Design a protein around this ligand. Structure first.
Ligand SMILES: Nc1nc2c(ncn2[C@@H]2O[C@H](COP(=O)(O)OP(=O)(O)O)[C@@H](O)[C@H]2O)c(=O)[nH]1
Ligand SMILES: COc1ccc(N(C)c2nc(Cl)nc3ccsc23)cc1
Ligand SMILES: [Mg+2]
Lengths: 427, 67
């Protein structure tokens, strides 16, 4: 059951590269693609994410995409950059200028067939393709505009495969341009229709965590991406390793999404750690459980107590008592039962994996489908309309052939998404 | 959605082309009327200088008649 990974644009390729660094280390693959590994749990499901090449090398099933060559050069210059298959670098030259319209309609359209050709080659070698995972931001032009263009075309050619994304939401606290709310809103409209699951990675939350919890005065994208790579490693655990669950992307979708459009997840992680500085006391299973459910550990800047959990998936990594894990997980639900919808019985499922992530003896990763995610979309909707009511900065988009009407439809669809999440928060 | 995608890029091509077209026609019309107007002004200037030669001939004629 092979997954095809695609990373698009500046943010997509930077968090994409970190993800492949991190899970390669967990599976015992070095920058050359060779396995110098301790345990054999590391290789049992290694084919979900890695093609095997002659000479027992492991090559990521990864495609790197950008309309601008710069950050893909840095990836190839990067530590594990030599592990990626060079044919799977697909890039243009003109960039996207932080413009969804250029990524989606004019620049990205010129390049998208070359990417689909690379997607096809990787898929035809798959015994049974699960589907795809895309890393991208929603605030730029390439990951957002061309990424959602790729999703739409991938769906046309593979309509029975699962589409999963890790989507980084823009925040004024960590912001490149004023038009991010425009790019994000146009993208969400695409994500609502064309993904089965998207992890909402909120740059607001990543910033708040670094500043407040990790006491990092001036957080860089490097500090943000340490959080992102830890979250990506955790939420993938049950796809990559053998366990009592043996999950795949479709089963995750079936068990997490009660209504098709409500497929946007708040990820959570514990313990929260900053890069480089290690702390030497492991948590207790009781500590892991409380931190993973704490709003201060959510990667989407929403208060869970402002909504209800439709479904939750939790994964505990490290050598620990599964009895204690079970008791602590039962404890949080029984003590906080009002925050779990009563009409989905037993909507919390826990998995355990023996292999911990690098640098931690124990970790807990949280995947929540909460109606509180609507706060994220409301925040973006306010920033959109603040400019849109004066049609501010629109010429960047009408200059690529876009119409105001398209902005009105995307805003209206995202408002409907907020309404639907509100509908189930009271039931 | 594919239909709408190529209509967007065709629209972008059509606006950019139309802008190029109107700029080219605008200055072609501007340079044409500028050339006419300047020539009309120079033509009027010569036409009045030439009238000064017509008048100067008449002046000498009247002097001859006075003999
Ligand atoms: N967390 C994180 N966010 C990023 C990173 N790079 C860019 N972003 C976000 O992505 C947005 C810029 O879009 P970008 O991906 O650079 O444009 P693109 O090159 O067209 O894909 C900004 O709002 C940033 O907040 C990164 O390394 N980490
Ligand atoms: C709400 O009930 C459920 C929620 C999710 C699942 N499935 C399929 C998972 N898939 C992956 Cl990939 N990881 C995890 C980790 C914990 S559950 C889980 C199963 C039941
Ligand atoms: Mg950028």
């Amino acid at each position: 059951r092979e997954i095809v990974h695609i990373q698009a644009g500046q943010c997509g390729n930077q968090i994409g590269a970190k993800f492949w660094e991190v899970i390669s280390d967990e599976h015992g693959i070095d920058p050359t693609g060779s396995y110098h590994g301790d345990s054999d749990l590391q290789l049992e499901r290694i084919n979900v994410y890695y093609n095997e090449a002659t000479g027992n090398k492991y090559v990521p099933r990864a495609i790197l995409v950008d309309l601008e060559p710069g950050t893909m050069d840095s990836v190839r210059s990067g530590p594990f950059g030599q592990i990626f298959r060079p044919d799977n670098f697909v890039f243009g030259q003109s960039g996207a200028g932080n413009n969804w319209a250029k990524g989606h309609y004019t620049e990205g359209a010129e390049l998208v067939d070359s990417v689909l050709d690379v997607v096809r080659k990787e898929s035809e070698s798959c015994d049974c393709l699960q589907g795809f995972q895309l890393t991208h931001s929603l605030g730029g032009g390439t990951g957002s505009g061309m990424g959602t263009l790729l999703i739409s075309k991938i769906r046309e050619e593979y309509p029975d495969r699962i589409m999963n994304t890790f989507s980084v939401m823009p925040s004024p606290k960590v912001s490149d341009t004023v038009v991010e709310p425009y790019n994000a809103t146009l993208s969400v409209h695409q994500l609502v229709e064309n993904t089965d699951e998207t992890y909402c990675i909120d740059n607001e939350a990543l910033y708040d965590i670094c500043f407040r919890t990790l006491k990092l005065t001036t957080p860089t994208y490097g500090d943000l991406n340490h959080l992102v790579s830890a979250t990506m490693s955790g939420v993938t655990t049950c796809l990559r390793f053998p366990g009592q669950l043996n999950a795949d992307l479709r089963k995750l979708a079936v068990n997490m999404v009660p209504f098709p459009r409500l497929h946007f997840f708040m990820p959570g992680f514990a313990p929260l750690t900053s890069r480089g500085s290690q702390q030497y006391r492991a948590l207790t299973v009781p500590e892991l459980t409380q931190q993973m459910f704490d709003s201060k550990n959510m990667m989407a800047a929403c208060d869970p107590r402002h909504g209800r959990y439709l479904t939750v998936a939790a994964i505990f990594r490290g050598r620990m008592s599964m009895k204690e894990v079970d008791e602590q997980m039962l404890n949080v639900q029984n003590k906080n039962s009002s925050y779990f919808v009563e009409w989905i019985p037993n909507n919390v499922k826990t998995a355990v994996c023996d292999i911990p992530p690098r640098g931690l003896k124990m970790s807990a990763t949280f995947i929540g489908n909460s109606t509180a995610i609507q706060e994220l979309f409301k925040r973006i909707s306010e920033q959109f309309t603040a400019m849109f009511r004066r049609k501010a900065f629109l010429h960047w988009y009408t200059g690529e052939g876009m119409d105001e009407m398209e902005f009105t439809e995307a805003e209206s669809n995202m408002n409907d998404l907020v309404s639907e999440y509100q509908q189930y928060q009271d039931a | 959605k594919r239909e709408h995608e190529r209509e967007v890029i065709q629209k972008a091509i059509e606006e950019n082309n139309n802008f190029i077209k109107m700029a080219k026609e605008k200055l072609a019309q501007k340079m044409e009327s500028n050339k006419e107007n300047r020539e009309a002004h120079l033509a009027a200037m010569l036409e009045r200088l030439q009238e000064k030669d017509k008048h100067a001939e008449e002046v000498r004629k009247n002097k001859e008649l006075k003999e």
